[PDB]
Design a protein around this ligand. Structure first.
Ligand code: CDL
Ligand code: PLX
Ligand code: PLX
Ligand code: PEE
Ligand code: 8Q1
Ligand code: ADP
Lengths: 459, 49, 98, 320, 54, 104, 55, 347, 88
């Protein structure tokens, strides 16, 4: 699949050789073309995966993720060029270089045929994200946010490296196809229990699992808008992808090692949804929303059924799109009033009607209105959990009610009421912002029209 | 324009430029020749041609 | 081993211990270093004489030469320290910390 | 070839070029005294290179083209507004004093490099050894704080100790009332606001610190106002000095090698002027620092190294 | 309106001889700007001798 | 000075509508901004969105859904006519399986 | 109670506190050769008996 | 100091190291160590001041003690087997003393106190030499006797070195002491894999030397020895600060940078034995080195600190001396991970 | 850490202790307001010895002027506090 990798590596010198006033145009056009090219990966088979070479392969689980990455790059470019207008040309090119490198690492991560190469790329994604957050953030908390983002990740990921090299010394290969075909059960011993934990905790902290998520509100609030977009839409899904890949060698030990993570996921889902009800910062609310949805995804991956895997794939794609749209919507108001407090600017539907429509659609997809793919994933996961145990419906049921409550709370607080009297600098919505919202939302409904493209390999 | 000599003048240092280019060309031709003899020796030892 | 070997090894250990625990004067520690060199000379000479290794009879001379170099180095450093502080106390060498 | 250890290993030695007329000379004096004319006459008679007094834009005169730059990108201080408002709440006074000390250090390094490279003598107006009289005059008049004086002392302590003091110090003595009369006769509307106490402080600093401590390094040639117009007499007075008392006679080839390596590499010369001591008078915020640096890099001959700016007519760049 | 950048108060945290100062190390001084400590006046007394009368 | 440092004042934000009443929010230069709008709209809505959706809609059936349906129809027809059971509990012929000799 | 205090207290704040305390313990030496040469003597003696006596 | 004398002393240092590396006789190895120390002492005092004198005295005392123990171990080995050849070291007590002496020479924990002090007391060029060239001889000797080495002592000292390097580096604002603690931790990593595979020791040594050379040359280019003086470099040469930031990231061990390769290969080699717990602890501990590298990157490259007025004069002048190998050192420090299988040529 | 932050009270106890250590002053008649010249019947030479005792006790020298005008313990305490910049 070098027909996708090489054009991004060419995006790099194209950006560094462009005129000072055409960098955004060139980057956007060629990013969109690369996304169109990557659209060809959706032609998947029913039995095995597309095995391009010894190094790269495409499954029905990673193709929508690659398409989402390549589609997210141009949106980040449009979202970034507003607040980077006063920046020098060299620093703007460096920002675009960081974004391009992040896309390249993400594209290679989702198609690596070996687990060590996957590890190296999934860990290389850290440097551009950390640089973006700590260099182009606005407030002084960005440094602490970068430290939290780095060390939470590495403390989980290093035992994974040890476990991976141990597994390769034991079985002779880390190639995923060989690993799948030559799978052997895991006994019940302390060594196997700790091997399970080493293979699972890095992906758990990436989701992130409740109690291990404290880095996420910091990193997602302190980052610039493109950083938040790529952190919520793609980088959280690395944990889910890696967990569905790695669980192939963990049976039958998972049958009982999943209990603490399942309880944490369900209860912390309830807790993070409740936290969303009393939040003064508009971005932290969206971050905690992400935590709740990812807790659902964790449950689906842990119970290990075809329906749960289908629901996990659909939910990951839907959440990426929805959360990126919500972050952009909040950033528009932040750029207008230079504050993140939710109750500062109110009654915005009176001043900005079309942006209010975009807010309504985004918050409707957040609460999983049917027949959106958000609800398809959520309902598949709920059915799988009900088959796992009939008592999960209570916890799942509570979550649905709470999610609707806080979504509409956000909508009513920001759009309805009366406009604050002292704020008189609320200019009309630019064409760029409306195009950004439309390019977020239209693919969601288009995917609803044909949902088998995001349902994973278990379809 | 400059107040002082700024020893590198408008023309480049021709001795250094010539030495650099000569070294590059010598290394390139040496590498080509070495690869050719290596291929010939490998083909002779294993009896391909 | 005989008793003389144990006695020479004990002398080496005592000189090493002497070097390790500093009192006030730097010169005392230099003397302990020279004592270790002398102990090593004696031990090597006894071993070489006992086994009648003819070509090894010249190593202890080399050892003495490099002992002299080491002592000269230490004395030069002591001269510099004393010129800086007017005293050869190891307490004065505390400008750099860990 | 650039001077360095290789040039010293084979051939180049400084001690051979010294030809009894090296004689670093500085001609000190109070404000508005005719020390510059005397310095020029001394240089002309003795055949030495003349260095006019280093101003705010001295460093501009030696890099790029000799033309001065905007005060915002160079100096960031004003001599005129120091006279207008000596007690301004923006730190102009000590900023000017610090910039002038740095300029004097650069000029001293340039003069020493010229002397050690050619063997020819140099004449300076003031030196880093004399710059402190203005600082003391400002402090006694309450124009600067005590912390500024401490910072100045730190920078001087770490900078002025690496060089050799001048061979002979010439001082032109002019009384304060005559100085005021001269300033009035001049016509500049900013120098008229100089109080007599300021000139008195400069004179006290000179005569009670500079000349006493300089007389121990080498003998000082003092002159009243009337006996300074006769330049030939002053020059012939200079030619009969017994200079065997200071550090200059005790310099061999290796010390000259070290000093010659130090006087070139002006970055090494200016190293300690920007120490991270955070005085409000001289500390510049990050946003303003970035803006001013971006402004500076856009000057016509400043973006790249000297021989690499094609926008001022540099050719054959792609072979340099 | 603009990105936050470190000021003097932020920068002064790194200006000490050590991070995380304690009561023992609060009196440690940072090294001099050039690595030259001021010379101590450790005067060495000359020897005084009676030359005569005997 | 009662100050701590020399700094520029925090500047007011620029309104792109002031110098360009139809500004599109892409750039301060009207021509570059207009062409940025045009390329974004053309390459996002006209090219990727509509054409990509058509391409995805008309992708060939590599998932073998219709092939499987036709195969199942053939199998059901054959098994119904012969009187054979529609489906078998064992997907592997027991003749090719060798159970362990002793269960005691 | 949970997100802002105890979840912070157990994992990251405890780690930071422990690392800072051990950094203070390790890095705060007076620079006197007497003390850590005595340390060297202790290390040498322990090493011969603890790891050397058992071969 | 005369340049000719300086060049002679440098060649004598290197001659002592090469004599250590090419000798087959224990006496010649000891002589190489003596010659190296004798020539190294004046190089530390090239810029004369009380701090340099103190650093030289401490270095001399530590290394003279180490060489005395080295000679005693050689003599004990000769006593129990009349062999002068550098081999499996037929006596266990002699091997223990030899290991302790070489650890003292390298600065492995518990005997690690001298390194921060000597590094802070000398110039950046002397520190470059001390932390790069002075590791070769003891490591070569350790490699030649790796079979007879006792794993329990070497691994204890290696883990202690990693822990103490991280903890000590956490507390420093002086750049030379940060470099010294980084050196201690990397020495620990080097000696942890020595009983299992000496090729990994050599690979780690080479990569560490490259990164250390790049860091020291960047520090010499921008004349900064404290954190606050390095915080000014962005307003004079931003490219230098960016390259330093990337090199600091590489030193931390983050993939896809070249720094990650030695740790990765050492972990794999240790898991090829049983040895599971030790690499896990080593990685968790190297996170501390990553922390203070990241703090340095925050202070020098990712944020802009306030500057001074006199920097405007520095803006007008260029760097006179140029280091010809700095670009290659930076590239080798950063972009070398894809060439990892080339380590086979090391054995 | 260094010495504790010396206060006015401790200064007073040290001054009074030094004064009652002087064999020419009876302890019970001495107060912080006693005047050396009149109350304690001490001559000018005696005062010089008291100032030298203060110098020894507090580790710093008092010039001939300055020290000469301190005629009772309270002035000595005030001078020591002002020199050491002690307010509590
Ligand atoms: C169901 C009807 C079917 C109609 C057939 C044709 C439908 C074509 C629609 C194409 C997709 C819509 C485009 C989305 C962006 C919105 C456009 C916009 O920005 O407004 C500017 C535009 C310009 O007018 P304006 O004066 O400037 O007003 C601007 C002001 O802000 C003031 O604006 P406003 O006050 O007028 O509000 C804007 C409007 C638009 O805002 C929206 O919310 C529209 C987006 C839908 C909700 C998205 C999240 C919910 C998840 C559901 C996913 C369904 C998608 C299916 C696939 C579609 C593929 C594109 O919002 C609403 O009025 C109410 C929204 C609540 C909808 C409740 C319905 C729930 C689902 C019902 C069934 C859905 C499945 C059908 C089949 C079921 C089994 C037979 O506004 C309009 O013209 C009105 C919008 C049209 C309303 C569409 C609502 C129903 C369509 C649902 C999906 C389409 C199904 C097609 C399958 C055939 C059946
Ligand atoms: C804040 C969020 C952090 C993330 C959450 C991570 C979740 C980690 C939890 C690990 C899940 C299970 C771990 C081990 C499996 C069983 C646990 C054990 O309690 O079960 C019994 C174990 O019996 C006893 O409990 C022995 C264990 C007692 C010592 C364990 C310490 C637990 C104390 C709690 C410390 C907190 C740990 C997490 C730190 C944050 C089973 O009996 P037994 O059959 O014999 O053992 C089975 C293994 N065999 C077959 C090889 C024999
Ligand atoms: C502003 C005003 C708005 C209101 C006015 C609108 C006026 C009406 C227009 C609205 C249309 C109504 C929709 C009704 C559905 C009709 C279309 C439907 O029939 O087509 C579907 C086809 O839809 C497409 O398959 C789905 C589109 C694919 C979506 C991919 C998005 C493109 C990429 C963009 C970036 C990706 C980001 C997300 C990463 C994963 C049928 O699928 P299928 O059953 O097969 O067809 C059977 C016959 N075939 C197979 C021979 C073709
Ligand atoms: C056995 C050894 C195990 C070693 C494990 C180390 C984990 C790596 C993290 C190291 C953090 C070190 C931080 C520290 O010690 O200092 C406290 C520090 C002081 O601030 P400074 O920047 O040093 O000072 C600047 C102003 N003067 O306080 C802070 O605010 C730190 C903020 C960032 C801390 C982020 C740590 C997050 C850790 C997440 C959990 C994983 C931790 C690692 C172990 C995981 C468990 C297996
Ligand atoms: C170990 C043995 C060595 C002993 C040898 C020491 C040598 C002695 C040197 C003698 C120096 C003089 O005579 S010095 C001259 C001394 N005489 C005067 O000054 C005349 C005025 N007298 C007074 O002021 C008072 O009587 C006075 C007592 C001073 C108190 O002073 P107050 O009223 O202000 O408290
Ligand atoms: N270091 C300094 N600090 C403050 N002012 C200075 C300094 N050096 C020169 N000046 C000012 O420059 C003006 C003229 O300088 P001066 O050399 O004394 O007269 P002239 O031009 O006749 O040589 C005077 O107003 C003097 O105060």
């Amino acid at each position: 699949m070098l027909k996708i990798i090489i054009p991004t590596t060419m995006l790099l010198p194209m950006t560094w050789m462009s005129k000072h006033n055409m960098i955004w145009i060139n980057a956007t056009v060629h990013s969109l073309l690369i996304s169109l090219i990557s659209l060809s990966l959706l032609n998947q088979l029913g039995e095995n995966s597309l095995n391009f070479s010894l190094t790269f392969f495409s499954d029905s689980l990673s193709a929508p993720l690659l398409v989402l990455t390549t589609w997210l790059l141009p949106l980040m470019l449009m979202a970034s060029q507003s607040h980077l207008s006063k920046e020098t040309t060299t620093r703007k090119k460096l920002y675009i270089t960081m974004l391009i490198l992040l896309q390249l690492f993400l594209i290679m991560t989702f198609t690596a045929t070996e687990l060590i190469l996957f590890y190296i790329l999934f860990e290389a994604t850290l440097v551009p994200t950390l640089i973006i957050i700590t260099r182009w953030g606005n407030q002084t908390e960005r440094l602490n946010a970068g430290l939290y983002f780095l060390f939470y990740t590495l403390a989980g990921s290093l035992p994974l490296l040890v476990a991976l090299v141990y597994i390769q010394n034991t079985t002779g290969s880390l190639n995923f196809l060989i690993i799948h075909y030559w799978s052997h059960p895991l006994s019940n011993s302390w060594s196997n229990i700790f091997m399970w934990l080493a293979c699972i905790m890095a992906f758990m902290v990436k989701m992130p699992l409740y109690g291990l998520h404290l880095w996420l509100p910091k990193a997602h609030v302190e980052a610039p808008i493109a950083g938040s977009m790529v952190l919520a839409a793609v980088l959280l899904k690395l944990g889910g992808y890696g967990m569905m890949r790695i669980t192939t060698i963990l049976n039958p030990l998972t049958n009982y090692m999943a209990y603490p993570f399942l309880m944490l996921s369900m209860w912390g889902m309830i807790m993070t949804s409740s936290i969303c009800l009393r939040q003064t910062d508009l971005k932290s609310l969206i971050a905690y929303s992400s935590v709740s949805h990812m807790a659902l995804v964790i449950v689906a991956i842990m119970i290990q059924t075809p329906w749960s895997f289908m629901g996990a794939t659909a939910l990951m794609i839907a959440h990426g799109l929805t959360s990126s749209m919500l972050f952009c919507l909040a950033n528009t108001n932040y750029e207008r009033v230079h504050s993140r407090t939710m109750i500062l600017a109110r009654g915005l539907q009176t001043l900005l009607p079309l942006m209010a429509t975009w807010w309504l659609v985004a918050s409707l997809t957040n609460l999983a209105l049917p027949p959106s793919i958000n609800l398809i994933g959520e309902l598949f996961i709920i059915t799988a959990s009900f088959s796992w145990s009939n008592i999960t419906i209570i916890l799942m049921g509570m979550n649905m009610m709470i999610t609707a409550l806080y979504s509409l709370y956000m909508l009513i607080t920001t759009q309805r009421g009366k406009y604050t009297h002292h704020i008189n600098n609320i200019k009309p919505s630019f064409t760029r912002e409306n195009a950004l919202m439309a390019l977020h939302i239209l693919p969601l409904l288009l995917l609803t029209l044909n949902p088998k493209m995001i349902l994973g390999p278990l379809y | 324009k400059f107040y002082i000599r700024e020893p590198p003048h408008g023309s480049p240092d021709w001795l250094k430029v010539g030495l650099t280019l000569g070294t590059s060309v010598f290394l390139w031709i040496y590498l080509i020749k070495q690869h050719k003899e290596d291929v010939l020796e490998y083909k002779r030892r294993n009896g391909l041609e | 081993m005989p008793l003389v070997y144990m006695n020479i090894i004990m002398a080496f250990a005592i000189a090493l211990a002497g070097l390790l625990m500093y009192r006030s004067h730097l010169m005392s520690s230099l003397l302990c270093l020279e004592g270790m060199m002398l102990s090593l000379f004696i031990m090597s000479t006894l071993i070489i004489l006992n086994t009648h290794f003819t070509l090894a009879n010249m190593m202890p001379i080399i050892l003495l030469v490099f002992a002299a170099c080491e002592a000269a180095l230490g004395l030069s450093l002591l001269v510099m320290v004393s010129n800086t502080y007017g005293t050869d106390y190891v307490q004065n060498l505390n400008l750099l910390q860990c | 070839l650039q001077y360095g250890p290789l040039a010293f290993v084979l051939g180049e030695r400084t001690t051979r070029k010294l030809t009894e007329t090296s004689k670093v000379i500085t001609v000190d004096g109070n404000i508005c005294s005719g020390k510059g004319r005397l310095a020029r006459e001394i240089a002309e008679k003795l055949g030495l290179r003349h260095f006019p007094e280093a101003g705010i834009h001295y460093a501009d005169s030696t890099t790029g083209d000799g033309k001065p730059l905007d005060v915002q990108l160079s100096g960031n201080c004003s001599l005129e507004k120091f006279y207008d408002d000596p007690k301004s709440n923006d730190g102009n006074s000590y900023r000017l004093q610090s910039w002038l000390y740095a300029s004097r250090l650069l000029q001293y390094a340039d003069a020493l490099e010229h002397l050690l490279s050619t063997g020819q003598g140099v004449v300076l107006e003031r030196s880093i050894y004399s710059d402190f009289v203005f600082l003391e005059a400002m402090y006694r008049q309450g124009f600067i704080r005590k912390q500024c004086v401490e910072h100045y002392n730190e920078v001087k302590k770490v900078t002025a100790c690496e060089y050799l003091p001048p061979h002979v110090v010439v001082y032109v003595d002019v009384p304060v009332p005559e100085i005021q009369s001269r300033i009035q006769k001049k016509g500049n509307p900013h120098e008229m606001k100089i109080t007599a106490a300021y000139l008195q402080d400069i004179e006290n600093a000179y005569k009670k610190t500079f000349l006493p401590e300089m007389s121990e390094k080498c003998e000082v040639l003092q002159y009243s106002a009337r006996e300074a117009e006769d330049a030939e007499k002053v020059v012939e007075d200079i030619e009969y000095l017994k200079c065997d008392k200071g550090p200059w006679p005790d310099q061999d080839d290796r010390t000259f090698h070290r000093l010659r390596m130090l006087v070139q590499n002006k970055l090494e010369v200016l190293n300690y002027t920007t120490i991270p001591v955070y005085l409000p008078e001289i500390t510049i915020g990050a946003h303003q620092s970035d803006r001013v640096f971006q402004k500076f890099t856009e000057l016509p001959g400043r973006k790249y190294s000297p021989g690499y700016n094609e926008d001022v007519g540099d050719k054959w760049i792609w072979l340099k | 309106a603009r990105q936050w950048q470190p000021d003097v108060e932020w920068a002064e945290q790194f200006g000490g001889a050590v991070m995380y100062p304690t009561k023992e190390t609060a009196h440690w001084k940072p090294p001099p700007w050039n690595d030259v400590d001021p010379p101590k006046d450790t005067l060495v007394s000359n020897l005084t001798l009676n030359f005569g009368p005997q | 000075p009662t100050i701590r440092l020399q700094e520029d004042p925090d500047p007011e934000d620029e309104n792109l509508y002031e110098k360009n009443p139809d500004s599109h929010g892409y750039d301060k230069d009207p021509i570059v901004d207009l062409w940025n709008m045009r390329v974004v709209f053309f390459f996002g809505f006209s090219i990727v969105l509509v054409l990509g959706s058509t391409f995805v809609a008309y992708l060939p059936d590599y998932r073998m859904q219709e092939w499987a349906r036709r195969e199942a129809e053939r199998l059901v027809k054959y098994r119904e006519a012969n009187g054979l059971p529609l489906m078998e509990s064992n997907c592997f012929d027991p003749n090719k399986i060798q159970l362990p000799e002793d269960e005691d | 109670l949970l997100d802002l205090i105890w979840l912070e207290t157990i994992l990251p704040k405890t780690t930071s506190f422990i690392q800072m305390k051990m950094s203070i313990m390790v890095s705060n030496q007076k620079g006197l050769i007497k003390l850590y040469f005595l340390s060297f003597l202790i290390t040498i003696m322990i090493s011969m008996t603890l790891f050397n006596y058992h071969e | 100091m005369n340049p000719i004398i300086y060049t002679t002393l440098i060649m004598t240092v290197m001659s002592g190291t090469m004599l250590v590396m090419i000798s087959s006789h224990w006496l010649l190895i000891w002589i190489g160590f003596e010659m190296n120390l004798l020539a190294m002492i004046p190089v530390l005092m090239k810029n004369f001041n009380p701090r340099a004198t103190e650093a030289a005295t401490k270095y001399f005392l530590t290394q003279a003690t180490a060489s005395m123990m080295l000679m005693m171990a050689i003599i004990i080995n000769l006593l129990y087997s009349g062999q002068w050849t550098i081999t499996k070291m037929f006596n266990p007590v002699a091997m223990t003393m030899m290991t302790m002496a070489l650890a003292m020479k390298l600065g492995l924990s518990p005997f690690h106190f001298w390194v921060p002090e000597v590094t802070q007391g000398i110039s950046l060029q002397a520190g470059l030499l001390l932390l790069t060239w002075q590791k070769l001889a003891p490591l070569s000797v350790l490699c030649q006797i790796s079979q007879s080495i006792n794993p329990n002592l070497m691994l204890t000292m290696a883990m202690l070195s990693i822990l103490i390097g991280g903890w000590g580096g956490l507390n420093q604002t002086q750049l030379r002491k940060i470099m010294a603690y980084s050196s201690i931790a990397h020495m620990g990593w080097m000696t942890a894999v020595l009983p299992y595979n000496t090729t990994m020791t050599i690979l780690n040594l080479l990569i560490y030397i490259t990164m250390t050379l790049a860091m020291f040359m960047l520090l010499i280019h921008s004349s900064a020895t404290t954190t606050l003086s390095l915080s000014h470099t962005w307003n004079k040469m931003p490219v230098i600060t960016s390259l330093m930031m990337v090199t600091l990231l590489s030193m931390g061990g983050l993939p896809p940078l070249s720094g990650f390769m030695p740790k990765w290969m050492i972990i794999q080699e240790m898991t090829k034995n049983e040895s599971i717990i030790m690499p896990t602890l080593m990685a968790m501990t190297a996170l501390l080195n990553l922390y203070f590298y990241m703090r340095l990157a925050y202070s020098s490259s990712l944020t802009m600190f306030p500057s001074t007025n006199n920097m405007k004069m520095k803006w007008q002048f260029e760097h006179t001396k140029q280091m010809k190998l700095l670009p290659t050192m930076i590239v080798l420090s950063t972009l070398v991970l894809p060439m990892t299988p080339a380590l086979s040529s090391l054995n | 850490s260094d010495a504790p932050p010396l206060t006015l009270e401790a200064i007073k106890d040290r001054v009074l202790y030094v004064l009652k250590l002087y064999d020419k002053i009876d302890p019970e008649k001495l107060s912080v307001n006693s005047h050396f010249m009149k109350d304690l019947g001490l001559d000018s030479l005696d005062q010089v010895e008291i100032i030298m005792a203060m110098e020894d006790e507090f580790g710093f020298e008092i010039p001939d002027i300055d020290a000469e005008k301190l005629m009772c313990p309270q002035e000595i305490v005030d001078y020591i506090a002002d020199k050491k910049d002690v307010y509590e």
